[PDB]
From a paper:
The Phe231 to alanine mutation, which destabilizes this interface, slowed desensitization recovery of GluA2(F231A), both in the absence and presence of TARPs (γ2 and γ3). NTD and LBD changes contributed additively: the R/G-unedited (Arg743) isoform harbouring a mutated B/D NTD interface (Phe231Ala) recovered the slowest. This suggests that the re-assembly of desensitized A/D LBDs is attenuated by Arg743 through charge repulsion, resulting in a greater proportion of A/B LBD dimers, and thus non-swapped receptors. Closer analysis of the three sets of desensitized structures reveals a gradual transition of the LBD tier into four-fold symmetry, which is greatest for GluA1 and smallest for the edited GluA2 mutant: GluA1 > GluA2(F231A)-Arg743 > GluA2(F231A)-Gly743.
AMPA glutamate receptors (AMPARs), the primary mediators of excitatory neurotransmission in the brain, are either GluA2 subunit-containing and thus Ca2+-impermeable, or GluA2-lacking and Ca2+-permeable.
Numbering used by the authors:
A (entry chain C): 422 to 551, 569 to 625, 633 to 764
B (entry chain B): 569 to 626, 633 to 666
C (entry chain D): 765 to 773, 784 to 813
D (entry chain H): 5 to 43, 55 to 84, 93 to 162, 173 to 210
Write the structure that this text describes.
């Protein structure tokens, strides 16, 4: 059932043929195998005479029209980007401990203990010095200096003042670095955007008009995207639109899928409603009803498409 | 201990404003309270300053139009806009 | 084709960025103990 | 009480010494990803001296860390030759000897101060050692149990240090009484 099942029925009525729907064996749209030169997908089924017509979202391309016959476009479209709606991971409960690394925090504790003990030792060990800095008071002095929360007592000896001085210096440098990093810690909308990056994974259908569009695009941005995508890991090429879409959903927005605008718009209206179409159409192309190159059915399919266009069968099927 | 209720409120206020000490709590219990207030003050005050430094560096929908009238709205007295509205089957 | 079509080309402060202040701190703790023992 | 102070100090000495020695010996400082043994990327125990391999074709093969693969030279030297972790063990030992010799040759009262100084210095040496290790490693990862043993050694050593100085202070107070 669906747009193309409803379209096939109306196509058959207006083309004037009896028909049997069959799902393409390899589940691909159609590309000239890079290597064996064999046409795969629905295009291949027409080229090798396994099928007499392809009522499918098959993009009219020159190489396709050179090996199969196409009706007029029953749909105008273009490659589009599907992104998982952002929803930035909420701040952690203890995210305020982020401007400094874990090891810095650990060593700040170790240094606090070290400074406190050494202030006690240097301040009270000598018998020639007999409130003042006992152990509890020294821990309190040290904490107070780090939290910059003032001093009730201060060392008076030379020894104690060296300890206090270096702890004050340490505190200033460490605390200021926190304030600053926090500042910095608190300081894609198109195909061009995707092309100028790689972080967000993005790719085309493994085999069809989309992959071929990029392998053949003369647009710098799309060639740039293609340069990345053919090499993108994990292979950003997908067997079905849903696979790229699921790739999009499962990545929390870390995968954008270059499915055609038609597919993008459809998936945007499907649960869990977590994806969104961004970017313009990457080409001004159309889908056509395809037949084997030179097939008699081509003329009926061209005429029926125009009838279903003047009626709005294809457009009704879209909505 | 000079930490009556008034001096406690003063101690706490002064600490948040990163200002003077005068009295400083002297028991273990009071020092635990003082320490966590000091930590809280540091994180909160640092966050205010940092975010200010960012704040110093860097009618809408059709439903809105329908839901209000202070901002009146209309169409070309004769036009395709006026006609869509006259025939729209969308409630809004 | 052969030049560019096939082109192959905030974070928390780490301990490495602040290690110097730790070295000075521990060095200073060392000197204080020397001064005290000498006195 | 006075008899309890010496017991706590003595048992803590043994504890800190044992923990630091186990840590310097064992290989569970940083569980990270790498080579178990090679002239490809699996989890590895990786201690202070030798890196071994948890899970792998030669799971169990342990090779020596190639510490050396001006400032980096010096840091890499201070790290390779674990002068700071090792010096901590040495000082903690000396401190234990002093505590023990508080008995025979008693009433000296300066053996106890020396013991305190050695334990505090052992703590400071350990922290420099930790900083050097962490700084070197850096140019996922999780710290093993020997790293955390090292850390507990520092804390116990500082505490034994405070107790030692406290005992010295009391000795001289009673002597002045
Ligand atoms: C701002 C404003 C500052 C207001 C000043 C604080 C009150 C001072 C009273 C005081 O010092 O007297 C005594 C308390 O006296 C009482 O009996 C307290 C009565 C309850 C009031 C508690 C308000 C604060 C609690 C939450 C408010 C929300 C204690 O002092 P003294 O030892 O008697 O001298
Ligand atoms: C009042 C009392 C105050 C306390 C007084 C003085 C305190 C000063 C303490 C010593 C200073 C550290 C030495 C140091 O940084 O040397 C090296 C690291 O150092 C290391 O990697 C060695 C690690 C342990 C050394 C610290 C011992 C304490 C770095 O090499 P460098 O030659 O320092 O060159 C600078 C680095 N730079 C060129 C890459 C920018
Ligand atoms: C009178 C009471 C005594 C109290 C005294 C307490 C000490 C306070 C200051 C400590 C920091 C000073 C040390 C700064 C080290 C400078 C490092 C240096 O020279 O930098 C190296 C080089 O220039 C870069 O490559
Ligand atoms: C002598 C007087 C003693 C006074 C004593 C009071 C001083 C308390 C100060 C700060 C406490 C801060 C507590 C820090 C807790 C953070 C730990 C945490 O949350 O770390 C887990 C992390 O989120 C995993 O990812
Ligand atoms: C003088 C005391 C200063 C305050 C010390 C703050 C305590 C910090 C404790 C360590 C928190 C570690 C957070 C990172 C944890 C992680 O990412 O695994």
């Amino acid at each position: 059932e669906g747009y193309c099942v409803d379209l096939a029925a109306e196509i058959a009525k207006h083309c004037g043929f009896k028909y049997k729907l069959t799902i393409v064996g390899d589940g691909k749209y159609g590309a000239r195998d890079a290597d064996t030169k064999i046409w795969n997908g629905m295009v291949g089924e027409l080229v090798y005479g396994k099928a007499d017509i392809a009522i499918a979202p098959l993009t009219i391309t020159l190489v396709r029209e050179e090996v199969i016959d196409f009706s007029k476009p029953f749909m105008s479209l273009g490659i589009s980007i599907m992104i998982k709606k952002p929803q930035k991971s909420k701040p952690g409960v203890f995210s305020f401990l982020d401007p400094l690394a874990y090891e810095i925090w650990m060593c700040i504790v170790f240094a606090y203990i070290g400074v406190s003990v050494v202030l006690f030792l240097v301040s009270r060990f000598s018998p020639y010095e007999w409130n003042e800095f006992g152990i509890f008071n020294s821990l309190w002095f040290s904490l107070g200096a780090f939290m910059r929360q003032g001093c009730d007592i201060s060392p008076r000896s030379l020894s104690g003042r060296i300890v206090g001085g270096v702890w004050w210096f340490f505190t200033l440098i460490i605390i200021s670095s926190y304030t600053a990093n926090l500042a910095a810690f608190l300081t894609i909308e198109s195909a061009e955007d995707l092309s100028k990056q790689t972080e967000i994974a993005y790719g085309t259908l493994d085999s069809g008009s989309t992959k071929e569009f990029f392998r053949r695009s003369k647009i710098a941005v799309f060639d740039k995207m293609w340069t990345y995508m053919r090499s993108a890991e994990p292979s950003v090429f997908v067997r079905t639109t849903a696979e790229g879409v699921a790739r999009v959903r499962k990545s929390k927005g870390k995968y954008a899928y270059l499915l055609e605008s038609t597919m993008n718009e459809y998936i945007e209206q499907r649960k869990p409603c977590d994806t969104m179409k961004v970017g313009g159409n990457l080409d001004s192309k159309g889908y056509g009803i395809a037949t084997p190159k030179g097939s008699s059915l081509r003329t009926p399919v061209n005429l029926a498409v125009l009838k279903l266009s003047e009626q709005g069968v294809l457009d009704k099927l879209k909505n | 201990n000079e930490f009556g209720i008034f001096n406690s409120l003063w101690f706490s206020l002064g600490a948040f404003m990163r200002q003077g000490c005068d009295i400083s709590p002297r028991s273990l219990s009071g020092r635990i309270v003082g320490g966590v207030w000091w930590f809280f003050t540091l994180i909160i005050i640092s966050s205010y300053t940092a975010n200010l430094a960012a704040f110093l560096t860097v009618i809408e929908s059709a439903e809105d139009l329908s839901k209000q009238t202070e901002i009146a709205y209309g169409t070309l007295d004769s036009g395709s806009t006026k006609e869509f509205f006259r025939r729209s089957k969308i409630a809004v | 084709k052969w030049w560019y079509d096939k082109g192959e080309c905030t974070s928390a402060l780490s301990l490495s960025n602040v290690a110097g202040v730790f070295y000075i701190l521990v060095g200073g703790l060392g000197l204080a103990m020397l001064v005290a023992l000498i006195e | 009480d006075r008899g309890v102070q010496m017991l706590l100090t003595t048992v803590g000495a043994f504890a800190a010494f044992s923990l630091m020695t186990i840590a310097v010996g064992t290989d569970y400082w940083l569980y990270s990803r790498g080579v178990c043994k090679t002239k490809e990327e699996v989890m590895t125990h990786s201690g202070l001296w030798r890196t071994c391999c948890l899970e792998g074709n030669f799971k169990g093969l342990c090779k020596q860390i190639d510490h050396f693969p001006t400032a980096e030279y010096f840091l890499r030297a201070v790290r390779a030759s674990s002068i700071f972790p090792i010096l901590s063990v040495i000082l903690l030992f000396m401190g234990g000897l002093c505590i023990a010799a508080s008995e025979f040759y008693k009433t000296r009262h300066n053996i106890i101060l020396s013991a305190g100084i050695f334990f505090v210095s052992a703590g400071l040496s350990n922290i420099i050692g930790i900083i050097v290790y962490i700084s070197a490693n850096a140019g996922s990862y999780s710290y093993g149990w020997s790293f955390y043993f090292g850390a507990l050694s520092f804390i116990i050593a500082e505490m034994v240090g405070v107790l030692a100085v406290h005992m010295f202070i009391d000795r001289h107070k009673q002597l002045r009484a």
